Design a protein around this ligand. Structure first.
Ligand SMILES: Nc1ncnc2c1ncn2[C@@H]1O[C@H](COP(=O)(O)O)[C@@H](O)[C@H]1O
Length: 205
């Protein structure tokens, strides 16, 4: 199905987003055609769950489901925090460029959160999740954003463009928030997606 909403973990570590800005700029100074493929300043996030919310009532149900999700996250994390190290560059078949999530224990925890989120939302009546295996990633560019590239002289991201960063430590993000975001509504003034609702993770209540 085609989703229109998603749960999003914003990247709150300014070092990570600043380092990705450098990476995007390094790429653009080599080929300015890639400008419209870059994700916008302020939009950096990890997608946790996609879904359809197709009317105002369903948007309100989604907000309720996210509120319900909060305690499950802290159960999964066992009263500690989830540290996400962002290191190196990966792609999905040269069409989407992302900063990779380093391997480690936090990957299984993040996967458990995604699966519990899917279950939580489905039990509230929301079509959510994907059949495809969840592959967490922090996108910096996607060719699909720039449909004239395909039609023109650029059909994949040349790996030479990001070679200097292929193995760069961007930084570590501690999970602090999950937002319910609209894919299609206008972005906030700070460049982030329209947010219906948000919960805090990892803080004293
Ligand atoms: N497991 C996957 N395999 C291939 N492409 C993916 C996968 N997960 C996400 N994508 C694509 O990566 C693009 C950017 O991801 P995102 O920044 O999370 O929206 C999305 O349009 C997804 O369709």
């Amino acid at each position: 199905y085609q989703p229109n909403y998603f749960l999003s973990i914003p990247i709150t570590n300014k070092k990570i987003t600043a380092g990705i800005k450098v990476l995007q700029n390094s790429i653009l100074r080599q080929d300015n055609r890639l400008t419209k493929a870059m994700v916008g300043d302020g939009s950096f996030h990890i997608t946790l769950l996609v879904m359809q919310l197709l009317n105002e009532d369903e948007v309100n149900i989604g907000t309720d489901a996210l509120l319900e999700l909060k305690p499950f996250v802290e159960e999964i994390l066992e009263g500690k925090h989830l540290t996400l190290p962002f290191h190196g560059i990966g792609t999905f078949q040269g069409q989407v460029g992302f900063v990779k999530l380093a391997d480690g224990d936090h990957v299984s925890a993040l996967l458990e959160i995604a699966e519990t989120a899917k279950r939580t939302f489905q039990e509230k009546g929301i079509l959510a999740g994907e059949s495809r295996t969840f592959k967490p990633h922090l996108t910096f560019m996607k060719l699909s954003k720039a449909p004239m590239l395909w039609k023109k002289g650029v059909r994949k991201i040349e790996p030479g463009l990001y070679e200097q960063f292929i193995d760069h430590r961007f930084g570590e993000e501690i999970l602090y928030q999950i937002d319910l975001c609209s894919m299609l509504k206008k972005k906030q003034s700070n460049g982030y997606y329209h947010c219906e609702s948000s919960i805090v993770i990892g803080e004293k209540d």
